[PDB]
Write a protein of this length. Sequence first.
Lengths: 301, 301
Amino acid sequence: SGFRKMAFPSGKVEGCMVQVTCGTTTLNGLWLDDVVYCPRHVICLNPNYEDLLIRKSNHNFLVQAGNVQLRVIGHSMQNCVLKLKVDTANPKTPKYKFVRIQPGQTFSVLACYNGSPSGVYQCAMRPNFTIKGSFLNGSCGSVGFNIDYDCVSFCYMHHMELPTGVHAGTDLEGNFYGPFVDRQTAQAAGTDTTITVNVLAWLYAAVINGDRWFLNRFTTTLNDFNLVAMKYNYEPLTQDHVDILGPLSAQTGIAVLDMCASLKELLQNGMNGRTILGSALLEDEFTPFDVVRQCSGVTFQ
Amino acid sequence: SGFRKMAFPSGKVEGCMVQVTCGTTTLNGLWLDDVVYCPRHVICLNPNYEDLLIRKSNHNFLVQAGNVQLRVIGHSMQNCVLKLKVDTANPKTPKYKFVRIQPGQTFSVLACYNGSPSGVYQCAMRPNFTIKGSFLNGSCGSVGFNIDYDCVSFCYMHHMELPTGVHAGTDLEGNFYGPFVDRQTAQAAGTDTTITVNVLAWLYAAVINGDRWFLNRFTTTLNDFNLVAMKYNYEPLTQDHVDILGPLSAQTGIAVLDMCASLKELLQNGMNGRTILGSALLEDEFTPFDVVRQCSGVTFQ
Ligand SMILES: *[C@@H](CC(=O)OCC)[C@H](C[C@@H]1CCNC1=O)NC(=O)[C@H](CC(C)C)NC(=O)[C@@H](NC(=O)OCc1ccccc1)[C@@H](C)OC(C)(C)C
Ligand SMILES: *[C@@H](CC(=O)OCC)[C@H](C[C@@H]1CCNC1=O)NC(=O)[C@H](CC(C)C)NC(=O)[C@@H](NC(=O)OCc1ccccc1)[C@@H](C)OC(C)(C)C
């Protein structure tokens, strides 16, 4: 037992991480098969990458996997991502997919500098298409991922920080999450919201781990729950979020609307100085799947 | 910028993780060089391992690294750890040390089942020689580690859970942290304490990341700070903990006793519903070194 902020093992991703320099500008790339993927920002207020890209040649790109230099035999741009075709297929290429995720979904970040992995942590795509990361100068090209079965689902590539100390990036087809651009013109995320379905998933993790004080005798309708939830800046709970909470409901024998009723009381009356899984806030960066993986799914590894 | 619960990349450790079965009892082992290390519990209320061990032979031990079977050519016991000598030196053996850590120090856990890595999270050795982990049936032989430079410092091997949903384990010489034994006789951890020096390290991370509301004009002596801290179940701050807070003090230009003064006000007056780095509790599972690594040290990777 126990409940931690658990990331996926990073090894399969560490084997794909390389350094990409265009002239003397350096950041991280992802080396899968023939191709290295990195932010197009490497080739540079309001730049015209289309032209900067064509004005470049394959000798303007130095890619190193540790010691070894990868010979760049072509370069192409797709959205905000650069793709460099190289002589060599990465022999440590795992099984993988490029996946575009929805707000509320979680993933692991391997933070990289100079093409070398320095750390792992768990993130959520926030409702405002931001992530709350930890990224410094040189982190761009760091990727987010889930390990779906034997298979790395890459969902995020790091591009920038906004003034609130929050972070923005693309899918691996180089399309931004949310309304952001890879240029240093004033942009802002706008107000975030709490991920209702993830908080309920985490009250279910708390019960599974024997933290039960917050449970009550009451029930609620979906509309009476949302009427309270949206006052406290929580996303409305949708029938579909009730649906995917079904398996955690059956395991615990606590009906989703009864957990809603317990959540409603917590929001109106606070914690009374008590904690839930060693937290004084309701946590919203665990999904239903995250709870089932950590609390049991993990033993079949 | 940003501050997350950051683990070390797990790849170097994933390359050492193997499955160890003695007859039909299965758990995780650590494959470094000639040797696989695992809990002696694999060879089994109050067992006599010395005898159970001798009554065993090298064909009673099946070790698999993925597909490949490792031929066991000898077995030996050191404290609570089994060491199996094998035909083959692990070709993915990283540079490593066995290190015994002190309460307050943090490390990364690679949680393993069936010899396969399933997750990574960050832990602290608690003052009561417990860790707050996430471990199920089959997790034993999962290791804790720091990556000190190029070098994996292995500090923990998982052995058991106590009734409070907390966890106990050994160094890699198989000596327990704290007063615990690898037998299913009633043991208990006893009351824990808050790691004063880590909380101050994390108020320094908060300032570095521009979270500054809690700072005040006041100062305090060490004794007046401890007089308040120990009321709230915090370890007394020692001159030596003031010492290792020096580099974070100079970087932020906030004197350690001024941060102490700010901590004293937080403990006496609470948060007023405000948060610090998105937390409503003072966090004590970041050390001084952890703050410097995440906030800057990481870019030299
Ligand atoms: C990755 C770049 C890299 O590795 O390249 C080295 C060659 C970094 C990651 C940033 C660094 C700081 N923390 C991170 O996560 N990315 C960048 O530096 C971005 C470059 C591209 C956008 C070209 N720039 C920023 O992230 C920038 N944000 C920004 O300017 O955009 C919005 C904006 C808001 C107000 C005013 C103007 C623009 C950062 C560095 O700027 C701050 C002030 C928001 C921190
Ligand atoms: C690792 C064993 C493994 O993988 O072997 C498979 C062959 C597990 C890890 C535990 C499982 C549950 N969560 C964990 O972290 N280790 C064990 O099962 C321990 C075996 C050795 C001690 C022989 N047993 C326990 O952890 C046990 N604790 C315990 O009995 O010790 C103190 C005690 C307290 C009260 C009464 C008697 C003894 C757990 C399983 O028992 C509970 C009730 C404390 C959960």
